[PDB]
Design a protein around this ligand. Structure first.
Ligand SMILES: *CC(=O)c1ccc2cc(N(C)C)ccc2c1
Ligand SMILES: OC[C@H]1O[C@@H](O)[C@H](O)[C@@H](O)[C@@H]1O
Ligand SMILES: [Ca+2]
Ligand SMILES: [Cl-]
Ligand SMILES: [Cl-]
Ligand SMILES: [K+]
Length: 310
């Protein structure tokens, strides 16, 4: 067969979710196309250099997980000039940037949905457990661990999780919120400081992803929770360690971020484009929305259906 080369840039390799995505992409590509996969080390200048090299090396298609998703416009400019099609994934280009060229696609998921499902987990717990309102004021005191500033999943999961709790008829009070950039250790450090400041005032913890929820859980353990003393913590992704924390009883719930189907859709699009074929639902195996987007559903995960994540 003809060798097809796809340039793949991952925003950083030390991201738990994106490790799942790139491993699944590598599995899908086996026997079909050569992935030239690089680590952008959470640096857009690094990724810009990598994209330039992909283009110089005449990749047949690009699959880019952009560090700064607002940089997708400049990446599209370069790709258009080189006539190399590009699919973006997981970090979403701005909608007007997507209209710059007709060989540009995006694969991801509707972050609003993951926020809603998060909020439902917490609201349902709150309604079933009167003891959760530790200061008996009829208000849920919570803290919020956000992802990276400006990332669409951080913006939308933060907004929709809490709006969903309010929509469920529950009054809320935000004690603290901060960016922990999807990182376990940073979330741990933020949560530890909050526990020193506010202590038993905290009644609920929301995190935009599992790694941050897990860091929060470690700070909570250190402060005496989850032995004997309980607090509900919710995340997003249903990674292997997230699933383990659900089983341990330390994570109340999460939302499956379907890396396997996002990887398949991304690969399939890049593979068709590498062959000079326009993606269709028939030839990539997924619905295409607004001519450019493939949205993969999120799914609620608690101890009640932990096998749905496995
Ligand atoms: C990218 C993402 O969110 C995600 C979700 C789940 C997930 C699970 C696993 N295993 C169960 C091994 C690996 C990666 C992964 C990533
Ligand atoms: O872009 C990276 C981020 O993507 C999000 O969709 C995932 O939930 C996070 O775990 C990940 O760090
Ligand atoms: Ca309260
Ligand atoms: Cl930690
Ligand atoms: Cl799917
Ligand atoms: K406990």
């Amino acid at each position: 067969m003809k060798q097809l080369n796809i340039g793949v840039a991952i925003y950083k390799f030390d991201d738990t979710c994106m490790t799942g995505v790139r491993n699944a992409m590598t599995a899908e590509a086996q026997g079909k196309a050569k992935l030239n996969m690089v680590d952008s080390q959470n640096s857009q200048p690094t990724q810009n250099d990598q994209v330039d090299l992909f283009i110089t090396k005449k990749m047949n298609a690009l699959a880019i997980n952009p560090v700064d998703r607002t940089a997708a416009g400049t990446i599209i400019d370069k790709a258009k000039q080189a006539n190399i099609p590009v699919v973006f994934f997981n970090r979403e280009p701005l909608p007007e940037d997507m209209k710059k060229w007709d060989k540009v696609y995006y694969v991801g998921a509707k972050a609003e949905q993951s926020g809603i499902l998060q909020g439902q987990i917490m609201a349902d717990y709150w309604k079933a457990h009167p003891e959760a309102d530790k200061n008996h004021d009829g208000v849920m005191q919570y803290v919020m661990l956000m992802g990276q500033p400006g990332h669409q999943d951080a913006i939308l999961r933060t907004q929709y999780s809490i709006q969903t709790v309010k929509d469920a008829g529950i009054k809320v009070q935000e004690l603290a919120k901060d960016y922990a950039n999807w990182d376990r250790v940073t979330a741990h450090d933020k949560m530890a400081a909050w526990l020193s400041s506010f202590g038993d005032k905290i009644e609920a913890v929301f995190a935009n992803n599992d790694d941050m929820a897990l860091g929060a859980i470690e700070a909570l353990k250190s402060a005496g929770y989850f032995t004997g003393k309980y607090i509900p913590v919710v995340g997003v992704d249903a990674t292997a360690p997230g699933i383990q924390a659900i089983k341990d009883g330390t994570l109340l719930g999460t939302v499956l971020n379907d890396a396997k189907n996002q990887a398949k859709a991304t690969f399939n699009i890049a593979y068709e484009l590498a062959q000079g074929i326009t993606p269709t639902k028939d030839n990539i195996g997924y619905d295409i929305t607004d001519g450019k987007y493939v949205w993969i559903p999120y799914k609620k995960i608690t101890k009640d259906n932990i096998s749905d994540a496995e």
